[PDB]
From a paper:
β1,3-N-acetylglucosaminyltransferases (B3GNTs) are Golgi-resident glycosyltransferases involved in the biosynthesis of poly-N-acetyl-lactosamine chains. They catalyze the addition of the N-acetylglucosamine to the N-acetyl-lactosamine repeat as a key step of the chain elongation process. Among the characterized B3GNTs, B3GNT2 is the major poly-N-acetyl-lactosamine synthase, and deletion of its coding gene dramatically reduced the cell surface poly-N-acetyl-lactosamine and led to hypersensitive and hyperresponsive immunocytes.
To capture the conformations of the enzyme during the entire reaction cycle, we also determined two more structures of B3GNT2: unliganded and bound to only UDP (for the state when GlcNAcβ1-3Galβ1-4GlcNAc is released). Comparison of the unliganded structure to the substrate-bound or the product-bound structure demonstrates that the substrate-binding cleft of apo B3GNT2 is available to accommodate substrates for the reaction to occur. One example is the catalytic residue Asp333 aforementioned. The side chain of Asp333 points away in apo B3GNT2 but rotates to engage the substrates upon binding of either the donor or the acceptor substrate. It stays engaged after the reaction and only to disengage after the release of the product GlcNAcβ1-3Galβ1-4GlcNAc.
Author numbering: 55 to 74, 90 to 170, 172 to 359, 364 to 397
């Protein structure tokens, strides 16, 4: 196996089939990638950091909401966000991300990493703390919140679900620029039979995909780093799954090396469990933009601005009448 990820994952498979934890807590830079990865020095900076710190995922929680799931939630909303996105998070709080309760309790968390000053980010830590005290929906870990560290955001969130919210019935994970018709989510979840609910995982699933080889593309992956195809994976900006599956997914994450694209990593983890994400037409990653009617029978639409999220949500409340 010439590609680095394939070779490391293959060695990891041998580790987890022992005869008859250094890839999870080794947080010093793995200077070995310098020599074994051909052309390491001309790879972009994001690939260098990813390869160097691939074996470290024991990052701690700087901001936590321990009593978030004191009450068994029916649906846990887990929204990926960045420190400066105060308006996106607030618009979500006021529209589709509203918490609720009586057997259908809805709880909300925002998943943040660090935007550290050493990367020239403006110091917004005081406002972030003020926001966390006021809305109590901020979870923040001490890792650099970057594009290629989104798999870390995934794994660390699944860890938090395991320790702090293991009894949530269902989990929705999505981006902070996606509108979610949470009314339609709850209706769909309530309609599920017990067999389909237990290992539920639906989204905008992509089949027969592979790494983009064009260096200019955002999702570009060099052949040096990864070879082969991509598993079926839910992409876009949101997928929905059962809490039972989340607990299974987290325990398999140790057996799968982190991958630079977090959605592919989640698809990989599903493949390791022998599961297949289910494609649902209601997840329209793909839809630019009146027509409130499309919004009643959708589950989520990517993507929307803060103002649009509130505008669509207010309209959506009167849509059973109009549409
Ligand atoms: C994902 O997040 C982790 C956690 O923040 C990042 O790891 C950190 O990476 C930086 C490099 O940007 C490391 O800083 C370097 O440390 C060496 C130590 O000798 C120093 O010589 C350099 O000048 C630089 O300061 C930092 O140690 C490391 N932190 C931990 C806890 O491992 C990682 O880079 C992120 N990955 C991506 C792809 O962004
Ligand atoms: C991970 O664990 C090792 C060994 O316990 C520790 O030295 C390291 O600082 C930990 N990593 C982080 C990011 O805390
Ligand atoms: Cl502090
Ligand atoms: Cl914002």
């Amino acid at each position: 196996p010439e590609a680095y990820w394939n070779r490391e994952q293959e060695k990891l498979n041998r580790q987890y089939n022992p005869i008859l934890i250094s890839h999870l807590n080794y947080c010093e830079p793995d200077l070995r990638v310098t020599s074994v990865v051909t052309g390491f020095n001309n790879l972009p900076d994001r690939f260098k950091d990813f390869l160097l710190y691939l074996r470290c995922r024991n990052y701690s929680l700087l901001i936590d909401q321990p009593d978030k799931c004191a009450k068994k939630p029916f649906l846990l909303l887990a929204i990926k966000s960045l420190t400066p996105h105060f308006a996106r998070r607030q618009a979500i709080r006021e529209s589709w991300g509203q918490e609720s309760n009586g057997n259908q309790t809805v709880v909300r968390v925002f998943l943040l990493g660090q935007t550290p000053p050493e990367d020239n980010h403006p110091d917004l830590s005081d406002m972030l703390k003020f926001e966390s005290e006021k809305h109590q929906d901020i979870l923040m870990w001490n890792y650099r919140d970057t594009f290629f560290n989104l798999s870390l955001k995934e794994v660390l969130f699944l860890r938090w679900v395991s320790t702090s919210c293991p009894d949530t019935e269902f989990v929705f994970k999505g981006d902070d620029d996606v509108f979610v018709n949470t009314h339609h989510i709850l209706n769909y979840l309530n309609s599920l039979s017990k067999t389909k609910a237990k290992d539920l995982f639906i989204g905008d699933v992509i089949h027969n995909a592979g790494p983009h080889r064009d260096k200019k593309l955002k999702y570009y992956i060099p052949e040096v780093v990864y070879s082969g195809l991509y598993p079926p994976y839910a992409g876009g900006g949101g997928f929905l799954y059962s809490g039972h599956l989340a607990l299974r997914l987290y325990h398999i994450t140790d057996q799968v090396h982190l991958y630079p694209i977090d959605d592919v990593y989640t698809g990989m983890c599903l493949q390791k469990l022998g599961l297949v994400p289910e494609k649902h037409k209601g997840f329209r990653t793909f839809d630019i933009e009146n027509n409130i009617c499309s919004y009643v029978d959708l589950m989520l639409v990517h993507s929307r601005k803060p103002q649009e999220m509130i505008d669509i949500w207010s309209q959506l409340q009167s849509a059973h009448l109009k549409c």
